[PDB]
Amino acid sequence: APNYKLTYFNMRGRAEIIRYIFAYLDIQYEDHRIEQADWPEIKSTLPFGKIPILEVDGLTLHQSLAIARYLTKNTDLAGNTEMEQCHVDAIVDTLDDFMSCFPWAEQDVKEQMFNELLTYNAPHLMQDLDTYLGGREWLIGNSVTWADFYWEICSTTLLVFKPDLLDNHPRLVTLRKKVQAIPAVANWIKRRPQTKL
Amino acid sequence: PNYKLTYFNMRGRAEIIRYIFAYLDIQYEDHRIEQADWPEIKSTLPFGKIPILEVDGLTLHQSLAIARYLTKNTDLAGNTEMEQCHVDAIVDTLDDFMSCFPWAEKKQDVKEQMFNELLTYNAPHLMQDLDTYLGGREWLIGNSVTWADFYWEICSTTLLVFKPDLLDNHPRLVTLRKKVQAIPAVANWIKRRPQTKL
Numbered sequence: 001a002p003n004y005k006l007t008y009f010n011m012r013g014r015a016e017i018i019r020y021i022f023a024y025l026d027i028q029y030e031d032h033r034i035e036q037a038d039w040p041e042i043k044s045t046l047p048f049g050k051i052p053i054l055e056v057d058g059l060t061l062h063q064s065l066a067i068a069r070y071l072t073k074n075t076d077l078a079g080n081t082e083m084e085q086c087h088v089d090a091i092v093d094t095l096d097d098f099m100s101c102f103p104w105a106e107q108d109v110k111e112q113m114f115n116e117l118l119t120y121n122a123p124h125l126m127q128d129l130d131t132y133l134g135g136r137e138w139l140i141g142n143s144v145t146w147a148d149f150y151w152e153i154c155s156t157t158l159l160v161f162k163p164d165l166l167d168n169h170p171r172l173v174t175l176r177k178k179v180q181a182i183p184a185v186a187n188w189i190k191r192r193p194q195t196k197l
Numbered sequence: 198p199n200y201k202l203t204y205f206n207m208r209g210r211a212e213i214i215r216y217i218f219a220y221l222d223i224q225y226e227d228h229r230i231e232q233a234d235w236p237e238i239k240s241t242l243p244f245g246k247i248p249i250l251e252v253d254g255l256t257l258h259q260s261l262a263i264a265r266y267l268t269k270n271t272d273l274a275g276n277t278e279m280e281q282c283h284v285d286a287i288v289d290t291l292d293d294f295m296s297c298f299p300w301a302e303k304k305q306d307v308k309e310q311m312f313n314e315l316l317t318y319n320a321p322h323l324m325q326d327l328d329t330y331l332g333g334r335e336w337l338i339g340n341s342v343t344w345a346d347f348y349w350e351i352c353s354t355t356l357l358v359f360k361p362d363l364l365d366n367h368p369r370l371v372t373l374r375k376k377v378q379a380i381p382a383v384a385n386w387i388k389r390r391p392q393t394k395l
């Protein structure tokens with residue numbers, strides 16, 4: 001077991017997928033949460049100047065999904081075949097693309113853009129996901145993968161700004177319930193610092 | 198496998214897939230659609246986006262998910278599991294930046310404004326970071342070319358159209374482009390491919 005140190009803000013955000021993975025695999029790690037106020041001099045120290053980063057035995061990794069993928073390699077979270085891994089990867093990038101469209105670090109242009117994405121794109125993404133899932137218990141294959149984790153994670157944040165997101169998609173709510181019922185995840189959820197984002 | 202790649206008639210987000218097919222000498226249908234046909238095809242797609250790759254009657258989407266799938270167990274994948282993490286990380290950093298550009302913006306003044314801000318204010322910092330990350334090494338990750346090297350060349354070719362002086366202070370990054378373009382399979386694809394601006 002190597003020594004892990006995750007660095008991010010005190011929020012779920014882009015680090016949370018890494019945090020679910022560690023919790024599910026029961027891998028001990030240091031969950032380092034920096035203060036908004038300290039982000040300047042921290043940022044200048046990093047190779048690509050962004051967080052989260054994951055230090056592994058003195059080697060600094062970056063890019064939340066590159067890290068997530070690395071940590072789930074050779075686990076039951078990866079998806080069984082090379083094809084399934086493609087589906088896991090595609091679903092995760094689809095969710096990530098959409099979340100990336102929101103101007104998180106913007107103030108009056110921010111509200112317009114949020115509503116554009118939540119009123120136009122969101123229902124379309126929801127319908128596409130529901131169709132893609134259709135009937136299966138999990139998003140890829142017959143067991144849980146880190147794509148299901150990411151669905152639960154991204155949808156939790158989207159529901160903050162659009163509470164009715166899933167009112168007409170009970171099958172996508174069922175997937176959220178299934179992720180939250182995993183004892184390791186339920187346990188993390190109750191223990192993690194409560195944040196809006 | 199019978200492969201059919203569907204995208205616009207441009208390099209764009211499909212080009213990484215095209216480079217991989219060329220390097221591995223794999224046959225595929227390079228299906229290029231017009232804008233006028235786009236409404237009719239869009240409703241058929243899994244998430245309404247292109248590129249998609251059809252494989253023996255099954256549809257894959259997401260260019261980098263597909264790129265990664267195609268390079269699994271080939272020499273374009275990282276040599277180790279951690280190198281594969283470095284490859285993904287570099288690819289996503291490139292894609293992130295490229296994704297900030299409003300490529301589909303129908304208001305040309307807004308588009309041009311956002312393009313100018315990203316190219317003069319943001320691009321130089323990313324070019325510095327990539328150059329520092331490369332250092333004196335031959336390839337971005339490990340001892341040999343990976344699809345991250347392909348994606349650097351693909352993305353920088355497009356960025357150089359709009360900012361020709363992008364790599365003026367980064368000769369080692371320009372040498373990396375030249376090495377990728379010199380790989381025979383890539384060299385011939387650059388000659389074969391339809392000549393488009395983007």
Ligand SMILES: Cc1cc2ccccc2c(-c2ccc(C(=O)NCCN3CCOCC3)cc2)n1
Pocket residue numbers: 009012013014016036095096099100104105153154157197
């Ligand atoms: C679950 C998830 C997934 C995301 C995927 C792509 C992009 C952003 C994502 C986010 C996300 C990321 C960041 C924020 C977010 O609130 N960012 C602002 C950064 N703050 C730093 C401290 O000082 C104030 C500004 C909100 C949401 N969350």
Ligand SMILES: Cc1cc2ccccc2c(-c2ccc(C(=O)NCCN3CCOCC3)cc2)n1
Pocket residue numbers: 205208209210212232292295296300301351352355395
């Ligand atoms: C190499 C590369 C990489 C990219 C990575 C992320 C996002 C966009 C990328 C692009 C890219 C993608 C799209 C465009 C682009 O020109 N998009 C416009 C889309 N259509 C408008 C209607 O007519 C048909 C074209 C330009 C560049 N290229």
Ligand SMILES: N[C@@H](CCC(=O)N[C@@H](CS)C(=O)NCC(=O)O)C(=O)O
Pocket residue numbers: 013014043049050051052062063064065289293
């Ligand atoms: N795709 C990257 C994005 C990294 C990113 O842009 N993170 C934000 C925090 S949510 C950041 O560091 N932005 C602040 C800055 O650039 O200073 C990832 O998933 O890790």
Ligand SMILES: N[C@@H](CCC(=O)N[C@@H](CS)C(=O)NCC(=O)O)C(=O)O
Pocket residue numbers: 093097209210239245246247248258259260261
């Ligand atoms: N991250 C995705 C992006 C897919 C995407 O947004 N592609 C664009 C074309 S470059 C698209 O389908 N947009 C047209 C539309 O939304 O109608 C990928 O790499 O495949």
Ligand SMILES: [Mg+2]
Pocket residue numbers: 093096097289292293
């Ligand atoms: Mg991405």
